[PDB]
Amino acid sequence: PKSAILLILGFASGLPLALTSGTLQAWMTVENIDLKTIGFFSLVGQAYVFKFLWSPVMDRYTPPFLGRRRGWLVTTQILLLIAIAAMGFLEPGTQLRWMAALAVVIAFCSASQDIVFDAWKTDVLPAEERGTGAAISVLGYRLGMLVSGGLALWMADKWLGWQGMYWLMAALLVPCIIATLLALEQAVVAPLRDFFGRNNAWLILLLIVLYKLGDAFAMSLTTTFLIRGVGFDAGEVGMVNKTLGLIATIIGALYGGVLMQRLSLFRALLIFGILQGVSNAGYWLLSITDKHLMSMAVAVFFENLCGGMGTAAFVALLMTLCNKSFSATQFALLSALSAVGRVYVGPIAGWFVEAHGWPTFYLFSVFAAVPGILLLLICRKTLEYT
Numbered sequence: 563p564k565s566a567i568l569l570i571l572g573f574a575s576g577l578p579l580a581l582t583s584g585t586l587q588a589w590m591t592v593e594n595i596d597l598k599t600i601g602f603f604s605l606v607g608q609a610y611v612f613k614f615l616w617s618p619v620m621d622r623y624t625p626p627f628l629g630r631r632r633g634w635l636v637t638t639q640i641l642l643l644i645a646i647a648a649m650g651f652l653e654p655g656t657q658l659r660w661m662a663a664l665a666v667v668i669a670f671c672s673a674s675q676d677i678v679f680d681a682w683k684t685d686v687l688p689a690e691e692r693g694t695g696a697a698i699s700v701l702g703y704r705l706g707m708l709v710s711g712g713l714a715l716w717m718a719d720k721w722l723g724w725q726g727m728y729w730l731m732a733a734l735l736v737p738c739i740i741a742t743l744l745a746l747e748q749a750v751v752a753p754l755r756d757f758f759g760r761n762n763a764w765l766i767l768l769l770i771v772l773y774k775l776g777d778a779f780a781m782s783l784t785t786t787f788l789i790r791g792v793g794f795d796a797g798e799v800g801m802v803n804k805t806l807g808l809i810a811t812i813i814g815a816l817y818g819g820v821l822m823q824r825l826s827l828f829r830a831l832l833i834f835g836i837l838q839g840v841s842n843a844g845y846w847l848l849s850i851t852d853k854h855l856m857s858m859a860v861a862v863f864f865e866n867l868c869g870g871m872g873t874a875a876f877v878a879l880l881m882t883l884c885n886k887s888f889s890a891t892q893f894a895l896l897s898a899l900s901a902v903g904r905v906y907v908g909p910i911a912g913w914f915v916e917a918h919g920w921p922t923f924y925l926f927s928v929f930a931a932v933p934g935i936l937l938l939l940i941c942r943k944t945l946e947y948t
């Protein structure tokens with residue numbers, strides 16, 4: 563029962579991810595609120611690219627009166643709860659002054675929670691082996707995004723008043739908090755010196771960001787693309803295209819976990835993540851397709867499947883890069899580089915979805931990152947050595 567703790571706490575650090583991301587865009591795209599500004603909510607998670615600049619300051623000192631007299635997952639999760647609940651309670655489309663009143667605060671709190679959830683509890687009490695112990699968290703997180711996001715809006719759409727859905731989420735945090743009660747000045751810079759001390763620091767830096775650049779386009783404006791001027795025709799039916807792909811990706815990752823051990827060809831990443839582009843064509847093939855009966859359901863279960871499989875492979879390679887004394891203090895840096903592409907991709911993608919429509923944005927712009935996989939082949943000269 564040692565691992566049973568992680569999953570429950572996973573939902574604490576997996577829920578707030580979608581409330582400023584896909585569900586905020588679905589909530590704005592259900593109203594008119596233009597088209598460009600729906601994607602202008604991508605700089606909200608700017609806190610997920612500066613999280614390493616203050617990763618060590620939060621911990622270490624933790625004076626008892628300020629913090630540590632109760633676990634810090636509480637000192638982040640309770641504060642997060644008020645901000646999330648107040649986010650939706652404000653004006654839906656009349657006065658949008660909340661664009662930053664509760665978007666930046668939510669991202670700040672989440673980025674402050676995932677850091678303390680990877681530092682003070684992950685490697686301090688892992689019981690040595692961290693492979694399966696950490697593989698359980700990915701599942702206690704994927705499932706948190708499944709609870710929110712697509713399936714979450716299924717009841718919100720039927721129910722009258724989107725603020726009620728927020729009360730569901732603020733109420734889904736109550737079990738977290740209750741199951742958790744029973745579950746340095748120079749610190750900022752001294753770590754960073756070991757990341758650029760390699761030959762291949764800049765090459766790995768570029769590879770980390772450009773590899774997933776393609777995978778971010780296909781999850782940037784899917785919510786608006788389907789319901790808006792497209793054969794989806796609904797919003798209630800959103801489970802068809804916003805839930806199936808989460809269960810498909812979680813399952814794909816689970817297959818990836820056993821398969822990686824089953825790896826018989828050293829390619830690993832190359833083959834497991836090369837097809838991430840041919841899977842995105844599922845959307846393009848539906849771009850010229852009428853609403854149909856099941857058409858959009860063919861791609862939802864296949865595209866999110868391919869990237870889902872490659873998820874574990876990415877994270878696992880990202881973990882091996884940094885397992886030294888500095889520990890997760892430096893891991894968080896590689897987790898700031900992974901979200902840079904998907905945080906800033908919105909406005910740029912939208913500008914391209916304005917001039918040349920949707921289709922050619924799915925064909926060329928999406929496949930821009932397939933060459934990056936080709937570049938990974940060169941990067942396999944130094945990666946193979948280790």
Ligand SMILES: CC(=O)N[C@H]1[C@H](O[C@H]2[C@H](O[C@H](C)C(=O)O)[C@@H](NC(C)=O)[C@@H]3OC[C@H]2O3)O[C@H](CO)[C@@H](O)[C@@H]1O
Pocket residue numbers: 610672673676680699700703704707873876877897900901
């Ligand atoms: C260990 C961990 O929590 N990593 C990050 C998490 O990524 C997860 C990521 O989920 C993505 C967003 C998703 O599938 O929607 C998944 N993929 C990668 C590459 O990180 C995987 O799931 C747990 C962790 O790793 O998300 C945020 C990144 O900005 C951050 O809160 C957090 O650093």
